[PDB]
Design a protein around this ligand. Structure first.
Ligand SMILES: CO[C@@H]1[C@@H](n2cc(-c3nc(Cl)cs3)nn2)[C@@H](O)[C@@H](CO)O[C@@H]1Sc1cc(Br)cnc1C#N
Ligand SMILES: CO[C@@H]1[C@@H](n2cc(-c3nc(Cl)cs3)nn2)[C@@H](O)[C@@H](CO)O[C@@H]1Sc1cc(Br)cnc1C#N
Lengths: 134, 134
């Protein structure tokens, strides 16, 4: 975790986390992690421009006691090298809902049953401009 | 800090950090810490409504290897219990500049000669709602 790390977030079900940043002009990939701590992530949100054998694909996963879950890939890639992008995340007992920069929404299943999200971390080719907590 | 803790901020000289939060309805005092880590703070920003023998006074200090420096007190207190408040902070080699909710500005000397601020923490009667980087 070499980008921003925030802890003690106490983000509750139905509350909105908003992250705005600028995608690097030569971006390969970037990451937003949410969960309890670095080893227990309800969401690893990983847009891949050209990385790990994916092109223009969002890969999401969970991490439970340091172990990756099953990957989920999306049908849409509303990111552009160089461009500002905002991502909004909420959750309930069943899913996280991720709203992307073109307003497209997808759900990622809530695997860890967290009562609250206490940890967020950013990494890769995305410079954070702001974060809002409900 | 029961409040938000952020690390890897990489805030550079001349960049503006904007922190917006909610002052608790019955607020006694709150803290914003900036520096290298919890033991090495270029700014401990401590508005005291009624705490530690101060009434409606901003106390600022530095912390160097765990040691509190010489306290600085301000003549102005533009905070109200049960309100939103924003503080904006920048620095150079000589001083931090703190801009308060009514636009009042004061300087606090840069005693640790930090060339980046990597650590922020909130504590006490203030819930961080938003953080912006320039
Ligand atoms: C390559 O690693 C990635 C992981 N990764 C990316 C990053 C970073 N990117 C930046 Cl930017 C900064 S840090 N850190 N770890 C992660 O995205 C994971 C999600 O399932 O996929 C593969 S590992 C993996 C997991 C499973 Br399940 C199956 N196959 C593979 C692979 N390959
Ligand atoms: C009381 O403690 C405070 C310190 N403090 C406040 C908090 C918190 N407030 C919240 Cl809300 C959450 S955590 N934690 N530690 C700090 O503000 C310090 C600044 O100089 O003054 C005194 S200690 C001190 C330092 C010096 Br130099 C001289 N006298 C004293 C005292 N007393």
């Amino acid at each position: 975790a070499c980008g921003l790390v925030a802890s003690n977030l106490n983000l509750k079900p139905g509350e909105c986390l908003r992250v705005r940043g600028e995608v690097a002009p030569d971006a390969k990939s970037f990451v937003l992690n949410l969960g309890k701590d670095s080893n227990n992530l309800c969401l690893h949100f990983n847009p891949r421009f050209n990385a790990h054998g994916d092109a223009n694909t969002i890969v999401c996963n969970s991490k439970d006691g340091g172990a990756w879950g099953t990957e989920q890939r999306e049908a849409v890639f509303p990111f552009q090298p160089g461009s500002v992008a905002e991502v909004c995340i909420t959750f309930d007992q069943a899913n996280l809902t991720v709203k992307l920069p073109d307003g497209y929404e997808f759900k990622f299943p809530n695997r860890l049953n967290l009562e609250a999200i206490n940890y967020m971390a950013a990494d890769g080719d995305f410079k954070i401009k702001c974060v809002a907590f409900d």
